[PDB]
């Protein structure tokens with residue numbers, strides 16, 4: 229029984245699973261603020277039922293695959309995945325649409341990475357306000373910087389009944405948001421504990437990965453249905469698979485933030501080592517980390533220069549970032565990492581000062 | 592309007608509040624295991640609806656105040672609190688019972704710290720199995736040790752309609768479990784973020800504390816009703832007040848554990864500084880911390896000697912413990928702390944080795 233097949237999907241559709249109501253949070257749009265995530269942390273998935281309060285702009289629930297073609301362009305190349313084959317290829321949007329409205333489910337093709345920020349569709353979609361407030365790339369990537377900026381903020385997903393993405397950790401160790409405009413997507417979510425990540429590493433690397441459903445090798449695997457109008461926020465590192473049970477069109481975006489930097493760095497190293505992608509969807513992770521380190525320094529200085537105290541999560545995030553900095557500039561590591569260090573940053577001094585301010589805020 | 596009064600209670604009974612369903616977890620007895628709390632962490636309150644799976648032994652829901660007198664003894668001294676006065680006194684259990692079954696609510700007296708481990712009532716009550724598995728004092732306090740062992744594992748609470756305990760952090764920075772045998776207790780729970788603890792410190796110390804309801808000075812204050820048969824587990828540090836709305840008899844116990852040692856140490860220092868108690872309900876906190884540090888060392892050694900990796904939460908707990916150790920044995924601090932160090936412990940060496948093993952498990 230191979231991961232993808234109509235018999236695999238058919239079994240999956242029946243599968244038991246641990247309820248999502250156990251771990252997820254279900255705030256409302258207006259409740260999902262920066263304070264809410266600072267206080268609660270962002271370590272479990274978050275399903276908002278209605279979009280009111282999220283600050284999203286979206287087309288109506290009657291937008292279509294054809295509307296997508298209209299706004300992106302028939303000729304744009306798009307990555308498609310063959311779901312009864314788990315393999316990647318380019319395809320012209322037009323041919324996708326041909327295939328789509330045909331009904332010829334002889335192949336099950338799935339589109340999940342159509343990034344449309346440089347198309348006229350960009351103007352019809354605004355991402356959640358929470359994401360825009362948190363996002364590193366959005367807030368802290370400088371304009372004077374001559375490194376390639378990652379552009380992963382807006383994706384369109386068109387997914388046909390019985391599509392399946394297998395268990396993975398997202399590129400960059402990014403966090404993700406998904407809004408289902410129409411249809412449904414079932415997410416199977418597994419917590420990224422050191423314990424589970426080890427089983428995950430082993431399973432990626434396993435010789436017969438394609439024959440083993442990873443959610444059976446772990447303690448808890450949570451089924452979370454994302455129906456029409458609903459929005460899912462998945463935290464850093466969460467190992468997840470996706471079954472699209474009926475035709476679905478969804479939107480989504482990937483971001484990094486300052487709430488659990490240790491888990492971000494961890495999710496980065498692991499996804500780097502296990503990824504079979506030919507390209508980095510998220511180039512220059514380390515570059516953005518460097519720039520964040522200095523911003524974090526400035527914040528500590530500011531908080532101390534005016535006799536206030538930083539939140540615990542940031543102190544730990546800072547410490548974790550600093551370790552990564554030392555690790556990337558050790559004499560033997562430095563050649564794999566040098567190219568990511570922005571030319572304005574004096575790493576020894578950053579590390580030294582970041583270390584000093586962190587010592588001053590420990591008990 | 593002073594904290595305690597029938598007009599204060601009367602207003603409280605009406606008060607709006609943020610729903611508890613937002614932050615609490617509601618597992619079942621069998622789901623509440625050591626793994627469950629390691630994976631989920633124990634950073635939000637946990638309400639189990641039915642006792643099945645908790646491993647508790649308890650008398651029936653028809654046990655009474657008189658049964659308590661029977662098993663503890665009429666003559667035992669018990670701390671009582673005058674709720675329209677927020678003041679502490681001793682009283683003979685007998686006189687409490689007289690007062691209790693009288694119905695003379697001219698004074699509102701409340702019993703919340705009757706510790707019955709050395710009475711015949713001890714044999715009728717067994718605490719949850721989760722607590723017994725986690726508890727430092729239960730598992731790691733050695734018998735060869737000549738320090739006074741804290742005895743806070745079993746409390747009986749008899750609380751009359753309109754009783755009120757004001758907002759506090761529990762002694763020792765301990766975590767707490769409460770089972771309501773009969774009646775109800777409403778808990779008003781506030782997260783112990785650095786942000787909220789500062790407002791809390793300020794409010795404790797405020798000149799007119801008695802006139803200000805602390806749950807109005809904070810972002811989020813959660814009403815959590817604990818009705819008959821239900822069991823509440825409150826985590827380290829949570830600032831909470833209690834309204835007993837109808838007559839209630841409940842049981843409970845206080846424990847420390849290894850899941851969030853940093854917050855435990857923090858909750859300790861703060862509660863130490865703000866407490867107006869004449870005695871330490873939890874003597875020798877630091878002593879037990881020393882012994883836990885060495886056990887944690889042995890675990891790191893063991894995990895490394897057999898090429899396995901410790902869970903992140905423990906690595907951080909260890910690091911936080913080690914800082915406290917350095918802080919308590921600095922040349923100038925040492926005289927306030929020396930007396931708590933068990934004579935078998937070579938602190939410089941413990942700290943040095945604990946520091947080394949923690950370095951070996953960082954990226």
Ligand SMILES: CN(C)NC(=O)CCC(=O)O
Nearest residue numbers: 340392393398399413470
């Ligand atoms: C790969 N990741 C970024 N995207 C997904 O997990 C979504 C794929 C899907 O919805 O099938």
Ligand SMILES: CN(C)NC(=O)CCC(=O)O
Nearest residue numbers: 703755756761762776833
């Ligand atoms: C003080 N703490 C340990 N106990 C409480 O918070 C319970 C008091 C009550 O139930 O009124």
Ligand SMILES: [Zn+2]
Nearest residue numbers: 396397398468
């Ligand atoms: Zn993904």
Ligand SMILES: [Zn+2]
Nearest residue numbers: 759760761831
């Ligand atoms: Zn308490």
